[PDB]
């Protein structure tokens, strides 16, 4: 059973991924800047729930993902969802130094982070990632390659060849983008490595964020949706 994904050109892969992009969603329109754990996480849980539905339908459009069994699809999304939410957050925060653009109408500064126990540490990590992407002049085409790598890679060792072939195709596509941008051969492999090492950082943030979400669950602070609870429970 040969997969269509492996037959795409680099340009077709990029086009597919750009076309699959979810929209940027809004938070609620109440002006009140959240400063409490309850108001903050109320907004974030609502936003994330809505983003998850778009994420699931985005994943179906990532070339190669459809070729997996439903069980494998479930596992990869369970593993990767918070990483994917986070890399999206860091991407849309790039042009807002020192701030996190959770939504166009929900821009937080780290001051609001300090008013939630456990949050500033992750806040700073996310800010550092955004700044790093900004200084690297990360392009949209590169971003969607990275997000797809997170989807396919983060659960692949907790299960095979098909996923690795698709990952290889995305590596090819990244290098293609860098060559198209005029990078020298040395610059291409150096940039590839820089980007993939940031993914270790994104994994780290997701790990710590997930622990905080579990603390959230146990404290019964904010009402959590059943979808979120099931996605979170996959990491217990």
């Amino acid at each position: 059973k040969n997969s269509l994904a492996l037959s795409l050109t680099a340009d077709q892969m990029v086009s597919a991924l750009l076309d699959a992009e979810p929209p940027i969603l809004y938070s609620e329109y109440d002006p009140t800047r959240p400063f409490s754990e309850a108001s903050m996480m109320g907004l974030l849980t609502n936003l994330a729930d809505r983003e998850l539905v778009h994420m699931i339908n985005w994943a179906k459009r990532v070339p190669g993902f459809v070729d997996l069994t439903l069980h494998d699809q479930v596992h990869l999304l369970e593993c990767a969802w918070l990483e994917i939410l986070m890399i999206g957050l860091v991407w849309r925060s790039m042009e807002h130094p020192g701030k996190l653009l959770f939504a166009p109408n929900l821009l937080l500064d780290r001051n609001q982070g300090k008013c939630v126990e456990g949050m500033v540490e992750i806040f700073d990590m996310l800010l550092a990632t955004s700044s790093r992407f900004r200084m690297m002049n990360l392009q949209g085409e590169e971003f969607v390659c990275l997000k797809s790598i997170i989807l396919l890679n983060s659960g692949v060792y907790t299960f095979k060849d098909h996923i690795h072939r698709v990952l290889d195709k995305i590596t090819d596509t990244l290098i293609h983008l860098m060559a198209k941008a005029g990078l020298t051969l040395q610059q291409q492999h150096q940039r590839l490595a820089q980007l993939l090492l940031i993914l270790s950082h994104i994994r780290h943030m997701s790990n710590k964020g997930m622990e905080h979400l579990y603390s959230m669950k146990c404290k019964n602070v904010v009402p959590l949706s059943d979808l979120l609870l099931e996605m979170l429970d996959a990491h217990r």
Partner: peptide
């Protein structure tokens, strides 16, 4: 029966 299982279906 996971919600995600339902949502990943057409």
């Amino acid at each position: 029966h996971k919600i995600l299982h339902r949502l990943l279906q057409d």
